[PDB]
Amino acid sequence: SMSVALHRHSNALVDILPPDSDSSISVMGENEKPDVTYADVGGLDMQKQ
Amino acid sequence: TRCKLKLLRMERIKDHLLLEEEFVSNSEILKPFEKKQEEEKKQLEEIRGNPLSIGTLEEIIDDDHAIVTSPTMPDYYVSILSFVDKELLEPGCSVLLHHKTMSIVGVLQDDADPMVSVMKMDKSPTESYSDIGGLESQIQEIKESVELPLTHPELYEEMGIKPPKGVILYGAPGTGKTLLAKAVANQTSATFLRIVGSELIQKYLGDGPRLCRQIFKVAGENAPSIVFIDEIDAIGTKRYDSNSGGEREIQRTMLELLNQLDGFDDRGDVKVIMATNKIETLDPALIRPGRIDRKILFENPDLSTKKKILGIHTSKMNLSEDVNLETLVTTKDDLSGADIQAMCTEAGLLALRERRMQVTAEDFKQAKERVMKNKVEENLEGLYL
Amino acid sequence: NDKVRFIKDELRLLQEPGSYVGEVIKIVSDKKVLVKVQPEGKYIVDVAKDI
Amino acid sequence: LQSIGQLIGEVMKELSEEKYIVKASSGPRYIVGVRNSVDRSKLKKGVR
Numbered sequence: 001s002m003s004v005a006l007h008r009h010s011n012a013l014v015d016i017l018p019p020d021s022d023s024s025i026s027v028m029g030e031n032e033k034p035d036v037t038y039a040d041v042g043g044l045d046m047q048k049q
Numbered sequence: 050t051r052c053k054l055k056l057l058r059m060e061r062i063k064d065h066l067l068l069e070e071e072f073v074s075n076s077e078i079l080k081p082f083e084k085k086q087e088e089e090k091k092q093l094e095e096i097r098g099n100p101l102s103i104g105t106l107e108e109i110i111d112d113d114h115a116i117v118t119s120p121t122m123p124d125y126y127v128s129i130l131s132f133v134d135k136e137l138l139e140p141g142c143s144v145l146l147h148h149k150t151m152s153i154v155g156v157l158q159d160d161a162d163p164m165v166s167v168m169k170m171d172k173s174p175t176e177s178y179s180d181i182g183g184l185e186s187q188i189q190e191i192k193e194s195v196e197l198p199l200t201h202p203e204l205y206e207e208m209g210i211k212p213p214k215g216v217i218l219y220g221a222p223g224t225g226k227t228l229l230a231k232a233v234a235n236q237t238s239a240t241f242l243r244i245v246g247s248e249l250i251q252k253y254l255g256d257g258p259r260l261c262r263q264i265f266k267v268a269g270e271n272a273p274s275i276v277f278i279d280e281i282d283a284i285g286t287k288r289y290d291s292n293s294g295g296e297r298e299i300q301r302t303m304l305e306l307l308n309q310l311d312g313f314d315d316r317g318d319v320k321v322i323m324a325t326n327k328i329e330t331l332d333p334a335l336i337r338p339g340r341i342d343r344k345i346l347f348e349n350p351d352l353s354t355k356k357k358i359l360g361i362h363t364s365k366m367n368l369s370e371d372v373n374l375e376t377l378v379t380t381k382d383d384l385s386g387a388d389i390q391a392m393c394t395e396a397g398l399l400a401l402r403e404r405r406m407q408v409t410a411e412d413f414k415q416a417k418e419r420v421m422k423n424k425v426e427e428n429l430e431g432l433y434l
Numbered sequence: 435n436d437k438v439r440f441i442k443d444e445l446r447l448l449q450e451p452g453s454y455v456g457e458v459i460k461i462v463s464d465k466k467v468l469v470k471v472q473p474e475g476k477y478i479v480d481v482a483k484d485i
Numbered sequence: 486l487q488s489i490g491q492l493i494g495e496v497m498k499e500l501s502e503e504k505y506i507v508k509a510s511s512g513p514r515y516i517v518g519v520r521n522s523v524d525r526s527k528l529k530k531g532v533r
């Protein structure tokens with residue numbers, strides 16, 4: 001059981017979708033961190049390890 | 050041997066005879082279809098078609114029309130048609146509507162629903178009196194109210210007061226009120242409807258009340274009757290969510306029931322049994338004290354009572370020859386028949402564990418230990434010492 | 435010939451209309467059955483030629 | 486009268502450059518196409 005495509009006017013299974021589809025968006029921004037790196041850190045070097 | 054032979058004689062001739070007579074008759078019917086029959090069946094098909102949508106008849110308007118409510122969200126103003134008339138119909142009955150163009154084309158359901166199936170039972174109850182044995186005094190409040198006016202309503206007329214009307218089984222869990230309701234209704238000799246009030250709760254609108262209404266209609270046909278609405282506590286006053294609700298329909302259902310208590314004519318012939326955990330598990334809005342009559346208060350079995358209950362259980366239990374009933378009663382203090390039922394079963398489990406056929410007295414102590422376990426009280430000697 | 439024929443026969447099934455899905459609650463006396471169509475309401479409907 | 490209304494959804498998820506999962510206001514989720522006229526640089530997830 002997973003999401004799948006059906007035709008609009010034939011109402012049948014013509015095509016398949018990944019299950020990834022029709023589920024929560026994954027990072028609503030772009031995925032990665034802005035220019036902030038291990039250089040910018042400044043912590044907490046050990047615990048970051 | 051001969052007692053077999055005689056029954057054998059009767060039962061073979063009646064069954065066998067009947068089979069041959071049915072077998073021939075299916076042919077004898079179908080060969081002639083000339084004249085009246087062919088005409089009748091043909092018209093009925095034409096007026097109808099395929100598929101036929103279930104409907105419900107809300108009311109009749111006196112001009113050969115009716116107001117109907119479909120399972121689809123719309124409701125509709127339809128014509129009354131076919132062999133089924135408004136004289137042959139009655140409101141609240143499920144009716145066949147033709148799909149394309151809504152008109153009553155017939156009926157085949159005749160007010161048959163999946164709620165109607167569960168409520169129905171016109172047979173005698175399973176338990177007879179003192180299966181249900183004992184809470185004798187409790188039976189000696191339910192019988193007074195429930196058995197007696199059905200049997201002779203005369204008594205009350207000579208007494209000079211209104212008959213009793215309903216009973217409220219309330220108080221302790223585990224006293225078997227859900228079983229007790231059965232016991233009495235056998236003794237009287239009457240029809241026994243049983244419905245669980247949880248199935249009168251619906252997330253569909255106007256459906257809640259339709260289901261309550263079906264009960265009293267049925268009850269009146271098969272009168273005298275005792276109707277058991279099991280768990281009126283389960284309509285209760287509860288709420289599913291308060292941010293998308295669910296707590297509207299609860300009220301409308303509760304209300305439809307308070308009205309037909311008295312309002313289904315002043316009769317003790319339309320008895321009700323309302324089982325409830327306590328009264329404060331119900332909607333607090335209530336009908337007056339005499340309309341429901343006596344409220345029946347279940348409380349814990351005393352020392353004598355739980356000998357009776359215990360005794361019933363252990364007769365059924367096999368291979369307990371090393372158990373003596375009294376000694377079980379000595380160690381234990383007052384408790385429900387519910388927990389006696391569990392102790393006896395936990396004692397089979399222990400003896401099955403060990404792989405030994407016998408069930409000891411010693412065994413039973415281990416079972417007492419398990420049941421009592423988390424009832425411990427040390428503030429008993431907190432006050433006393 | 436086998437291959438071209440099949441690709442066209444599956445297309446023919448798509449073009450012809452949908453189906454639904456019920457469960458038989460009871461049998462009624464015109465040789466129809468009371469079905470509850472699971473995602474919608476009830477429909478009383480005629481048997482097949484295989485049923 | 487000859488221009489006609491239009492339907493609103495929101496891009497629920499990007500399926501492809503030329504295929505989008507939109508969730509219609511009317512009701513059902515759809516896979517739609519991309520017109521020549523709308524550029525895919527404008528399209529992205531979560532935009533109306």
Ligand SMILES: Nc1ncnc2c1ncn2[C@@H]1O[C@H](COP(=O)(O)OP(=O)(O)OP(=O)(O)O)[C@@H](O)[C@H]1O
Nearest residue numbers: 180181182221222223224225226227228386387390
């Ligand atoms: N009078 C009796 N004689 C024999 N067994 C009994 C008797 N009363 C109760 N019992 C036993 O105890 C069980 C529990 O009773 P029952 O299921 O009727 O409870 P209840 O009081 O309606 O509780 P709730 O508040 O959960 O509705 C019965 O199934 C039966 O095995």
Ligand SMILES: [Mg+2]
Nearest residue numbers: 226227228324
């Ligand atoms: Mg109960």
